[model samples]
Target chain A: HHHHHHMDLVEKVKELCLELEEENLAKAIERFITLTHGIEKTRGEAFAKASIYGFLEGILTTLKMKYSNEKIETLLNEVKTAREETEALLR
Target chain B: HHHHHHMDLVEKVKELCLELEEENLAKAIERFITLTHGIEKTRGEAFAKASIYGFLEGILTTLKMKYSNEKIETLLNEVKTAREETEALLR
Candidate 1:
């Protein structure tokens, strides 16, 4: 149930991201960031995790707009690893 | 020491995050989001890691604003795990 709800939220976020991209890529990116930040502020760390995931999806969207999926995924992994390492430092 | 330098930078970012949180939480969140988005665009993966780390620290600062360290750290770890899992999915 919790997993299902989380997946639903992820799907909803993805749908919203696509809509935003189709409307205005730049504004979508900006609004997405603002929404993520707002979530982080209002909802605490759980929301922060979701927001960061959303932010990365947005970046992937932008990359897809310009390049291929393989390239984007490769770059995504690189960033993910870097992010994980940084998180380790925080610990 | 590289570790020392990184620690200093972390301290500086923490200080800045605090200043922003103190001045206006809303504006601070907005500006930090904007800055992170900009970094995502211009600097790619490397900057994404740094920016996400910075944004997380900002969230931590906001948590500190209202709560104690023990609670904040607890929540931070939870959020961090969520983020890591999300990244794993992308892989």
Candidate 2:
């Protein structure tokens, strides 16, 4: 049931990310937070951080598709490494 | 020199904002933190928070330019109202 709920929210986050345009970071963020807000609102915080991380991962996936820049590539590599450790359920 | 340094950093942040690709929030966040890290590394924390807020404002501006959705639009209005209050310096 929870995974199903999370799947639904991920779709919404996906839509918001795909809807991005005009090179606007603020709106990207606003959209980002709105989803986070929605997640926390409906699902509670247990999965909030992980869900947000998943969504952030989704955003990175989208950017890589659209761009082939070196700097972004460096960022992607650095973050993928950082995320596994940083985003894990640490004790 | 300080303002010049600040502008350089702002431009870097702006570049990362413009460079978002895959609907990736993690990377967006990764890049966002990268900019903030650079700022603190170079400029110290006195202005770090403001700079981050400024960068956030830039992200919102860019998103607005690209999207006209009601959710985003409604958020824009609410944050604009809130930012002035939250983003100010006062006694």
lDDT of 1 by residue, A1-91 (tens): 1221233433443444354443343344344455455444443444454345434433443344344546445544543443343233221
Model 2 residue runs over 4 Å out of place are A1-91, B1-22, B38-46, B78-82
Model 1 C-alpha lDDT per residue in residues B1-91, reported as the tens digit of each score: 1121222433443454355443343344444445455444443443344344434533453344344547455444444444443333232
**DockQ of every candidate structure:** 0.02, 0.04
Return the lDDT, model 2, position B24: 51
- Encode model 2's per-residue lDDT on A1-91: one tens digit a residue: 1221334444443444444442344246455556345434443453343334433443444455555655444444433443333333433
The TM-score leader among the candidates is: 2
Model 1 in CAPRI terms: which quality? incorrect
- The i-RMS of candidate 1 is 15.2
**Recovered share of real interface contacts in candidate 1:** 0.00
Worst 10 residues of 1 chain B by lDDT: B1-10
| lDDT, candidates in the order shown | 0.42, 0.41
